[model samples]
Target: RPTFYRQELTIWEVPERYQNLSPVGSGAYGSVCAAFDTKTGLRVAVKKLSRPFQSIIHAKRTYRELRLLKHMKHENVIGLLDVFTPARSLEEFNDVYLVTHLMGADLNNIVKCQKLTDDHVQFLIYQILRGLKYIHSADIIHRDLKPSNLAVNEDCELKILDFTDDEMTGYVATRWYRAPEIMLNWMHYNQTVDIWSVGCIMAELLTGRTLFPGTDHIDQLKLILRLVGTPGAELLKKISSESARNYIQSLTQMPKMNFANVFIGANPLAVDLLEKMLVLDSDKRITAAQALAHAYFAQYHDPDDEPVADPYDQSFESRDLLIDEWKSLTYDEVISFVPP
Candidate 1:
């Protein structure tokens, strides 16, 4: 069980104004509580830090998250509605809380609930790309992206969340979603890390299972090399970090394997997008913006078409109308439905 309090301090804290419900989920860094706004009767998600004043590094990570929220705003990306931090309360420790729009469930949960049609998967991937484009445009890297970070409302509108400014000692994403470069120890990297994670997420959406199911860091690297092919001499020479170089060398000498064929049942368009994003060379990886223009997405998608229907419209009549309208939409029109 967890406790809730009403107070003010130097850093952000959950306002005593909102009624805190039981926690909806918990993670290594923090926990999220379901809260209701008394004034407006609107539902909201509240995230609270797990440990109070644990370390300077942890405090700085929370601070950076606050700054990131202040600077960026987009529909596809989770909206930061409000923040609470104690200014000068007489307490042994302090905590930070963030308020965000209430989304129905994450992609991970949705995938387990039902069998997704091809169109459904495409729609999800498009929304992710749109959100990434907006973040990259702001020169902010999400760093950690996976199914758990992607939330879908009842209407199937996807929202990207969980932005932090933690130190970059090594890899950041969940084991299965990590990119080959990070697995290889490439320290000099950029937003491409996110693109790789997206590729992994897309694969999971199609298969309903992790593409690279490795439990340890070394095994994760081996799984990546098995699918994408081992790095070459040129790629190894370009490695700027000693740790990344060593990791690459260790995998290269082990063995050669091919695992790309495992994705044979996936949609060709999806496969194409994955290949571009999962490139071993960091510089050569396809950018989120570039991925939006890929033929796989551009060929059949239409912006004018209604990309998604309200999840509440369960009536057969409403669904029929939605299908009819969707059939008439254009790729560009469908693209427009996603948040820019």
Candidate 2:
């Protein structure tokens, strides 16, 4: 149960190469700490998986996340610097450790702590879309893109975190940031789901408060329709669920609100982009690539600098391997990785 220890954080059982270990945060999945990596001469955040193989779902998600993280290489996305486990062999393997760039705080904490200017909002949102562009290019939808998932440094540089499709089940994805297509259980959904979340975050940044704070699924739709207004007749046709459609028709009709009126004193261009992004119809919603070209992000938009990734190999998602297989595969991936 031992490898290296430090008084700053006695709980960590990470590699000796990491020094100055101090707790960053912890949750149901695992815990993280900031450490100075002697090999790279840079501070890195180390995540220790709490119970990586506690269940089949947990194990599979762990495997998928690792594979996806390794495939990703982008400035706006969190980089997987290294992976290590103190376990001597497969029999003893239990914990999974991940090393990544250390960041100051997530958007959730930053929003609570300080107010951001229009310039800051524009820059931050631009990077979010920039990162989403690369992610979408690979045909991977983040599924869960909320304020907490966007990590930011002191310089206002933001990185998208936990960009996996693994549903948070039982505790469904955060309602405030979830898309209407997902909420309504539409027959199909796509990248525009992420755009809706970005819209939610953008609105939150502009208003300094959550735009729609619904108590439950029904309430959530009510809150969304209250502002964005009821879905149009043709757009509602896209949703295949009759009960959902009936529910929408049963509700009092709502006219769309003007962005300027909703987010007063906000930049007109920002409101214009927000309007496009918050479209009830996923088809009409502004895509990540299109949003970047909008005038709101004119100052930071540069086609050359905005890169895309090769299409991801989505075959792994089809595998229905057992827990042991997932564990063994994950171990092999971790051990075989030679970090640069």
Q: Residue 114, candidate 1: how far off, in angstroms? A: 1.2
Error of 2 at 315 (Å): 1.5
The model with the greatest TM-score is 2
TM-score of every model? 0.72, 0.90
What local lDDT score does residue 157 receive in model 2, on the 0 to 100 scale? 90
Candidate 2 C-alpha lDDT tens digits along 223-327: 899889998899878889999888888999999987788899999999999999999999989999999999999899999999999878878789888899899
Clash counts per candidate, in order, are 25, 0
Q: In candidate 1, what residue range of length 10 has the lowest lDDT sum? A: 327-336
Whole-model lDDT per candidate = 0.65, 0.86
TM-score of candidate 2 on Cα atoms, chains taken together: 0.90
Q: What's the CA RMSD of model 1 in angstroms?
A: 14.0
Model 1: per-residue Cα lDDT over 112-209, one tens digit each = 78788778887788888878877887666777798889998767789888762233223434556776666545656678889989888888777777
Clashes, model 2: 0
